Amino acid sequence: MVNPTVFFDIAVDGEPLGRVSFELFADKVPKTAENFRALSTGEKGFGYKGSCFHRIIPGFMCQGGDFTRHNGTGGKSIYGEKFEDENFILKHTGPGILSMANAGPNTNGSQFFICTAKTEWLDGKHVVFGKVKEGMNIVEAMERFGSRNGKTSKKITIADCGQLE
Amino acid sequence: MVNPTVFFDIAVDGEPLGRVSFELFADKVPKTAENFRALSTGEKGFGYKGSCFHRIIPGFMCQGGDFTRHNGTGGKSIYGEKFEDENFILKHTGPGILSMANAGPNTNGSQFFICTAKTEWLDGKHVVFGKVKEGMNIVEAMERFGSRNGKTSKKITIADCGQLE
Amino acid sequence: MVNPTVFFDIAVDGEPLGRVSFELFADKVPKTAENFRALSTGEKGFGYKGSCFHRIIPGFMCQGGDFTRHNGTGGKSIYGEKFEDENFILKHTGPGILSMANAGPNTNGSQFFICTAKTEWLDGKHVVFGKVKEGMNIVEAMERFGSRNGKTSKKITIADCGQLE
Amino acid sequence: MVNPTVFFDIAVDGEPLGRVSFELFADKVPKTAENFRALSTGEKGFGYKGSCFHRIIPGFMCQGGDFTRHNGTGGKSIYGEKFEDENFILKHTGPGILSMANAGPNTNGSQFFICTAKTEWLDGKHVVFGKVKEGMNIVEAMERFGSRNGKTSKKITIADCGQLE
Amino acid sequence: MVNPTVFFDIAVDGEPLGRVSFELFADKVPKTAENFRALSTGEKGFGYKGSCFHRIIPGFMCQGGDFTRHNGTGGKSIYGEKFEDENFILKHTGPGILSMANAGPNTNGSQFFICTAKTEWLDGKHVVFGKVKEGMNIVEAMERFGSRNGKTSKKITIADCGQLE
Amino acid sequence: MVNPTVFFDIAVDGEPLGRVSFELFADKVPKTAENFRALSTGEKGFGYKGSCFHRIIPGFMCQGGDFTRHNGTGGKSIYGEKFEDENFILKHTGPGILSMANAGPNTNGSQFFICTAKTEWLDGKHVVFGKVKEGMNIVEAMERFGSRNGKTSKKITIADCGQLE
Amino acid sequence: MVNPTVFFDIAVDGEPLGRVSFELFADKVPKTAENFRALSTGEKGFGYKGSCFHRIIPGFMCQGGDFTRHNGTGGKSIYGEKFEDENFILKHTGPGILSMANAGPNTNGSQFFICTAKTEWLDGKHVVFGKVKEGMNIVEAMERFGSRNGKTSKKITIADCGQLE
Amino acid sequence: MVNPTVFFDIAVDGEPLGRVSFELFADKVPKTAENFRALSTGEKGFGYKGSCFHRIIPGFMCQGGDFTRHNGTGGKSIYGEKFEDENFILKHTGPGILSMANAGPNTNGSQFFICTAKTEWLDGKHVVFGKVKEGMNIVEAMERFGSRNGKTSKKITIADCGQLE
Amino acid sequence: MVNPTVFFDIAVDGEPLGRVSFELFADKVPKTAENFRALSTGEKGFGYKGSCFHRIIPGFMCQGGDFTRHNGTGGKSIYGEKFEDENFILKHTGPGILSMANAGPNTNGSQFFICTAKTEWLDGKHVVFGKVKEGMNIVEAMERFGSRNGKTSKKITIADCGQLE
Amino acid sequence: MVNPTVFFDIAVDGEPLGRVSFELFADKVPKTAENFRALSTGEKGFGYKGSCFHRIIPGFMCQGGDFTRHNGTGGKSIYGEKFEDENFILKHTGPGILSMANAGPNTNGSQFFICTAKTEWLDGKHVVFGKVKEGMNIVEAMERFGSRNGKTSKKITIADCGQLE
Amino acid sequence: XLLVXAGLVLA
Amino acid sequence: XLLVXAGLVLA
Amino acid sequence: XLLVXAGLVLA
Amino acid sequence: XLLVXAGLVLA
Amino acid sequence: XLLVXAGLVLA
Amino acid sequence: XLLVXAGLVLA
Amino acid sequence: XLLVXAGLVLA
Amino acid sequence: XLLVXAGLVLA
Amino acid sequence: XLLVXAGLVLA
Amino acid sequence: XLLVXAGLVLA
């Protein structure tokens, strides 16, 4: 097919911060890309609009996607409770990589993380499925509200989200 | 703990045939039993009421549970597209055994079969999760509408279903 | 030996769309290439002449080869009900790749798919055995009648087929 | 299901010897039992009528079933050129056991052997699927035409064969 | 060696419910039993005193031990973040069995559960290390505050704990 | 030490067709190459002088070396009934490659095949041990006596054989 | 078939000590029994007659069978250089157990040992294939020519050997 | 062979405590019993005489055998710096069981421990090779000098040692 | 994240010898680098300040890190008594490499060694996590106090240590 | 450290043939290289001086190192009876390579071979640890006293040996 | 044969 | 998702 | 289902 | 340490 | 198919 | 030996 | 815990 | 030890 | 030999 | 063949 682009419009506490757009690698991991794509559009009746980034550790990554419990213990995929690790073709090559958070092998739900640095210790255990197309500087701004233990200082929120191409 | 009992009120071409009740072994396979019980109550918004047994081979088993495609190619679990083979504690020990149909390892969904014979060649590949409690005479009656290749002679349908205990 | 070429004359509903010729990689996968060749001539007494492409998904592939059930649940090989994956030397490198559909490892029958895109997520799970030699534009024309779910809008049929070289 | 019984009428050089009937353990190995039943009735267009026992070793077994090359290099199943080793539930417990000959794991075709002794060293390498029901005296008579290396002195032929129940 | 007995005085919303004593099977699982014993006395500086049962599913189990995050995501052992599964000698034979909660293989920390039924589906995945000696009636009183999803209606707290034997 | 070179004088029925000489790669597969070299000199009392090429498939290969049953069911090595697959270093790279025939892993005896084409699907399953040094034109002449099933039209014989270097 | 009985007439330099007979378990390990049997009659051209028990350790075992190098570095089977470990159905249960000596897995040739004690530490590594039928007292006599290092004091020899039954 | 018995004369700060005799199960683990026997006779020029029990934990075990570093980091076997785990046939069934201490698999040297309790969590990891024959009360006395961390309060030494039978 | 730099101020007996700075590879092994960093600052209550190098073998390495037993048998990590081998991405490439000492797989604690030679035989078994940044001349000076058996001739101590970068 | 150089002064029956020096690759295989060095200097009280090359096969290798039985059945290491294969980094790349002889995996003792050709079929089964530095012509002189079966005609002896560097 | 699958039913 | 199976087609 | 985990509780 | 899990976050 | 075996030659 | 194979019969 | 090793003794 | 091998006999 | 272990150091 | 073993030398 052609690789989908999704966008997140990020708000910090109340105010608009900006838009980050992502290319999703459906040519490498189509089932993982479609899961994220459909949760961004909200087409199945649930998804990411309104959810917050619950763990941001500067120089490492920002973690979001738990739209149910909002603390890292929830999320559901469009395929169900959890789904298999699709493949490990792609690597955590540098800042702006989008990858799945999981609770061990084959427990992919909806939580993901945006890398703010190259994280190659994570290769082989987390499925890489996308990359920041536009708005890296908005992710760099998001970084600043985190801490070494993941605590955010302001409620970083996906105010709106959806597909572009 | 208490093991749940669900019932099916069978109809042949609209004419009511009779009630079959099943004990589900939640004590051995709780996740596989829960999937069945909930698809029988219809409490998740989809389930077995109205569907039919699409393949019946006399002296072997009656296969049902495909409520989406009605021909063996569909159905879904209450946990998603598919779920893991829970365990293989129980064996296909005789007539009345309720076991899961599948499309290979860890692809359980909604389709099941009621054994009219001991089927030990299936041990270790299909998860046993219940047994006919009352109404084995109704299942034996259903058998007479099969054929060597599984085609039914009448539309064998689950007119109603729900939980008893 | 020399690699065989076979052709398919496609018809949309009834009118003759055009011919797609294929090169079969008998130098890499001889048993799988021979299966397809013999089913194209119809020499063993059954084959693809008259079957339809039953699932077409634009930007991914056209699936066909089920001359038995015509819906994806049948077909058979000239070697028996199924045969093994011969090897996975070749890769789904891009449009026009011809590859075997299957229902798991070593369940190859007669169904196949013509890729209209590079599908590398399928590498190592589906045996690649040939490539469109002429008539890619006809495969492009077929794509239009498909859907995201695969359902065709006109009956796409292999009106005639056989070997050329 | 009830287990089938097939028979073979054996003829030494033309002269009738007698009939052996066999019970096929369809309740343990249904696919292997069905292959033998069907080749005995001859309902698929080929089977055992007229084939000979090409290798008899006294106090070991009589091996036959090669209806294509008649020397041990051929034979075929109703499923195709070969089929899987279904399971190894039954063991080579005594004289009268009917088991599959093969060319290594999962190469079952039509060749079989009747044990004239307990052959337990073969356990787990050859699928046992039946036992002589009546006529062990005819097998005992057959033995006498073999030698230490297997060549028979007279042509031992399955003059007729089919199903009884 | 002699197997230690520890105790827990339970309180519901402040108001004291009663004491439960547990025997720890040090003769079977000494490292796992020492971790529970030492976290009950508080001798290493941290422990269970003042923590709560965060998940109680009636007829199944009472889960506790998260003294760091109090909600199921924390806890720690006296050996470090996580420790190895010692062995799986014991089984979940009935009510009153005490076993380690975990987040996959070799992730034992401090969370545990007391079974209020036999849970043999958990055998081989959770290390069993103790059983209720006296006070089972208090565990049964605790059940009465949970629900199918595990939520408790009141605050179930381990007021005090220590060693008796 | 140096790589030996053996010759075969081919005779169609009885007419001298010509000589084929081969280099044996004793520097990659010394045990497989000594087997073939010794069977070509007849120094261990038995060997290829007088045997025939029993299976010739044009555009694929010429198979021979069964000096005991002359049809593909026999032959033996200088080390015994069968011997181990030495290694799979060399590949079936083109016409002239001399490789071992077998009956699955570690059943090498004396049967071999001379490739008249690149056969890379056989890589890793058959041990390559030599290549035609001279007489490739004679091998192409032999091909013409074969057929698609391998049966010849004239008896192709190794009238003489021996070592050169 | 029936289990062979073979004999050895042992000579201590000059005078005959006596005859030991052995039952060979051809009902369990036919390929390993035929090897000892054929080497005891000498029918294949070489065998045991004239060889010595080169290593005897009192209270453990008498080892012989190296007819080519006489010291423990030789011997050969009727199948060749070496042959597979047939199975390990039988155990080293006591005095007068006859078992294969080897140089690790699948290196059986001709060397064997007669146990003068229950050697269960060797189960699973050495193929047991026979037992002293009559003549244990001659083996107990042989014993007293050994030493803890295996050195014999006098030249123990198999003067004659062959098959009784 | 016959199972050896070795004795140790224990002394507490030079003052004699008593003798403990050990039966070594050379019928189960011959290479491990021989190493302990030769180290108790000191026949290879090094051995247990004069070494101490460096770690005693009451109601668990007494550990000794480090005759080179006297602190648990040395020792050597008569076969070399370390030797393989012979087998795990015997289990830690009760007090007086003699087992090998090690630094992970196949690192046996000369350290051992005498259990004063059944230690079944150790089964499968430490080779059991002997049992206290007489002197269990002396082992019990030794316990009085240890502590939970293994520290002894007086120097517990092997005053003399050797083979009794 | 940015790779931290730590320093050790080495003292020989009492005399200050110099400062060694280390870059820690937190971009490759973050859990291992963090352990060494936190132990060099002392921020968890224990750490390297005041510990000595107990084993220096000239032309190989200097080993230290045992701050609990000071002889090679202790040390502990900030994650507990042991932690997993994080990964083996980095190799023992030359002088100055910092790698973890262990007692076999997954037993990392606090002990480490500084290579004064390329030690590639250790690759795959010890986790490399740092490199001497400045002060190699000081490590070389420390070398001069060791011996072929590791025994130092001075108390080579870490007088101070901490993080710079 | 710096790789050691050792020499062997070779004698044919009595006459001095010459010196062969070897570089030992202690930077790759230090435990294997130390064993050979120590046995060359004789420092542990046993070693190579006076031993002979018991097997020389011209154009393949010279085998020596059996100082205890002198025929290939003995020798021992400075580490014990045998020691593990350290690693297989180096390959048998050409003449002058010095490698370990063994009797299967992890049976290294003292026997070794100097190849006079490239022997890549042995890669991965024998550990390479050195190379002829000076004296290759003396090895070529030794060759001439071998034969295809490996028996020598003269007593090739290591008259002297020791470390140079 | 006698199997219970969902989709490609075999003999 | 985007797979090509014969019988139980999944997402 | 009826499981006892620490963190991602599944059905 | 620096990991990204769902439920039991470790160091 | 195109294989080289000794005994049971398959397609 | 005593085996039952189809094509390459061994001892 | 209660183990018997030679060198690194763990709990 | 007490083993029965052909060639390298160990203790 | 040249190894870096924690507790039982071997050659 | 051309092997270098210690005790049972095969071809």
Could you tell me the CA-to-CA distances from B161 to B10, B33, B34, B42, N9 in Å, in that order? 9, 15, 15, 8, 43
CA distance B63 to C72: 20
Does F55 participate in catalysis according to the annotation? yes
Burial of H13 from C-beta contacts in 10 A (0-12 / 13-18 / 19+): exposed
**Phi and psi torsions of D131, nearest 5°:** -140, 150
Which parts of chain E fold into alpha helices (H)?
30-41, 136-143
Chain C residues closer than 8 Å to O11 by CB: 31, 34, 78-79
Resolution in angstroms for this experimental structure?
A: 2.1
Joined together, the tokens standing for residue F60 give 């694929």
Could you report how far apart the first and last alpha carbons of chain A are, in Å?
Answer: 11
- For residue E109, give the nearest of G98, I79, H43 by alpha carbon: I79
CA of F55, closest CA in chain D: separation in Å?
Answer: 14
For residue I82, the SS3 value is coil
Specify whether the CB–CB gap between C159 and C11 falls below 8 A: yes
CA distance B152 to B120: 24
Joined together, the tokens standing for residue C88 give 């996975």
Chain S residues closer than 8 Å to J34 by CB: 1, 11
Q: Is the C-alpha dihedral spanning G111, G115, G116, G119 positive or negative?
A: positive
Specify whether the CB–CB gap between B66 and B54 falls below 8 A: yes
User: What contacts A20, CB < 8 A, 6 or more positions away?
Assistant: A7, A8, A10, A114, A132, A134, A135, A136, A138, A139
User: What contacts D43, CB < 8 A, 6 or more positions away?
Assistant: none
CA distance C64 to C109: 11
Interchain contact J81–H (C-beta under 8 A): yes
Q: Using an 8 Å CB-CB cutoff, list residues of chain G that contact chain P.
A: 1, 26, 30-31, 34, 78-79
For residue F136, the SS3 value is helix
Q: Residues before each break in chain H (C–N > 2.5 Å)?
A: none
Identify the residue whose tokens are 């599908």: C119
Under DSSP, the state recorded for J79 is S
Joined together, the tokens standing for residue G74 give 């030789």
- For residue K7, give the nearest of I72, F118, B103 by alpha carbon: B103
Under an 8 A CB cutoff, do I86 and A121 touch? yes
Sheet harboring B61-64: ordered strands across? B55-57, B61-64, B112-115, B97-100, B128-134, B15-24, B5-12, B156-163
Q: Which residues pair with A113 in a beta bridge?
A: A63, A99
Contacts from C47-51 at CB under 8 Å and sequence distance 24+?
C47/C161, C48/C8, C48/C110, C48/C158, C48/C161, C49/C158, C49/C159, C49/C160, C49/C161, C50/C157, C50/C158, C50/C159, C51/C157, C51/C158
Under an 8 A CB cutoff, do A79 and B79 touch? no
- For residue E62, give the nearest of E163, E129, E127, E151 by alpha carbon: E151
Interchain contact C104–B (C-beta under 8 A): yes
Joined together, the tokens standing for residue C112 give 């196949």
Question: What percentage of chain S's residues is helix, strand, coil (to nearest 5)?
Answer: 0, 10, 90
Which parts of A22-95 fold into alpha helices (H)?
30-41
Which parts of chain F fold into alpha helices (H)?
30-41, 136-143
Chain I residues closer than 8 Å to H103 by CB: 103-104
Instruction: Indicate which technique resolved this structure.
Output: X-ray
Specify whether the CB–CB gap between I59 and I53 falls below 8 A: no
Chains D and T touch (3+ CB pairs under 8 A): no
CA distance E33 to E22: 11
Q: Give the Cα-Cα-Cα angle C115, C116, C118 (nearest 5 degrees).
A: 70
Interchain contact G118–H (C-beta under 8 A): yes
Question: Catalytic residues of H, which ones?
Answer: 55, 60, 63, 102, 113, 122, 126
CA distance F100 to D103: 18
Under an 8 A CB cutoff, do B81 and L10 touch? yes
Query: Rg (Cα) of chain M, in Å, rounded?
Result: 6
**Phi and psi torsions of H97, nearest 5°:** -75, 130
Chain G residues closer than 8 Å to F81 by CB: 79-80, 83
CB atoms within 10 A of CB C109: 27
CA distance A117 to B108: 40
Could you tell me the CA-to-CA distances from C100 to C88, C106, C112, G5, L8 in Å, in that order? 11, 11, 4, 59, 16
Does F90 participate in catalysis according to the annotation? no
CA of C81, closest CA in chain D: separation in Å?
Answer: 6
Tell me which amino acid residue J100 is: M
Q: Which residues pair with F57 in a beta bridge?
A: F61
User: What contacts J145, CB < 8 A, 6 or more positions away?
Assistant: J12, J56, J152, J153, J154, J156
CA distance F129 to G49: 40
Could you tell me the CA-to-CA distances from G54 to A119, C120, G139 in Å, in that order? 65, 64, 14
User: What contacts G139, CB < 8 A, 6 or more positions away?
Assistant: G20, G62, G95, G96, G114, G116, G132
Joined together, the tokens standing for residue C164 give 């050329």
Specify whether the CB–CB gap between E13 and E156 falls below 8 A: no
Specify whether the CB–CB gap between C138 and C10 falls below 8 A: yes
Q: DSSP readout, D41-70? A: HTTTS--STT-B--EEETTTEEEE--TTTS
Cα D73 to the chain's mean position, in Å?
Answer: 15
CA distance G118 to G139: 15
For residue A129, the SS3 value is strand
Contacts from A18-22 at CB under 8 Å and sequence distance 24+?
A18/A135, A18/A137, A18/A138, A18/A141, A19/A134, A19/A135, A19/A138, A20/A114, A20/A132, A20/A134, A20/A135, A20/A136, A20/A138, A20/A139, A21/A132, A21/A133, A21/A134, A21/A135, A21/A164, A22/A98, A22/A130, A22/A131, A22/A132, A22/A133
Specify whether the CB–CB gap between E92 and E99 falls below 8 A: yes
CA distance C152 to C64: 12
Specify whether the CB–CB gap between C110 and C70 falls below 8 A: no
Tell me which amino acid residue J157 is: T
Instruction: Write down all domains in chain J, each with its CATH number in brackets.
Output: 1-165 (2.40.100.10)
Specify whether the CB–CB gap between E20 and E112 falls below 8 A: no
Specify whether the CB–CB gap between H95 and H118 falls below 8 A: yes
Could you tell me the CA-to-CA distances from D137 to C49, C153, D141, D142, O5 in Å, in that order? 54, 67, 6, 9, 38
CA distance B163 to C7: 57
Specify whether the CB–CB gap between J33 and J25 falls below 8 A: yes
Annotated catalytic residue within A24, A55, A111, A112: A55
- For residue H35, give the nearest of R4, G122, R2 by alpha carbon: R2
Could you tell me the CA-to-CA distances from G43 to F68, G79, I85 in Å, in that order? 21, 13, 61
CB atoms within 10 A of CB A119: 25
CA distance D103 to P5: 5
Chain E residues closer than 8 Å to Q1 by CB: 30-31, 34, 79, 86
Identify the residue whose tokens are 């070179």: F5
CB atoms within 10 A of CB D137: 12
Chain F residues closer than 8 Å to T5 by CB: none
Pairing of strands C112-115, C61-64: antiparallel
CB atoms within 10 A of CB A153: 12
Chains E, H: CB contacts within 8 A come to 15
Q: DSSP readout, E88-129? A: --S---STTEEEE-BSSTT-B-S-EEEESS--GGGTTTS-EE
CA distance D14 to D9: 11
Under an 8 A CB cutoff, do G120 and H29 touch? no
Joined together, the tokens standing for residue E130 give 């103790």
Under an 8 A CB cutoff, do F66 and O5 touch? no
**Phi and psi torsions of J29, nearest 5°:** -130, 70
Specify whether the CB–CB gap between G21 and G29 falls below 8 A: no
Specify whether the CB–CB gap between B32 and B86 falls below 8 A: yes
Identify the residue whose tokens are 């073993």: T5
Tell me which amino acid residue C15 is: E
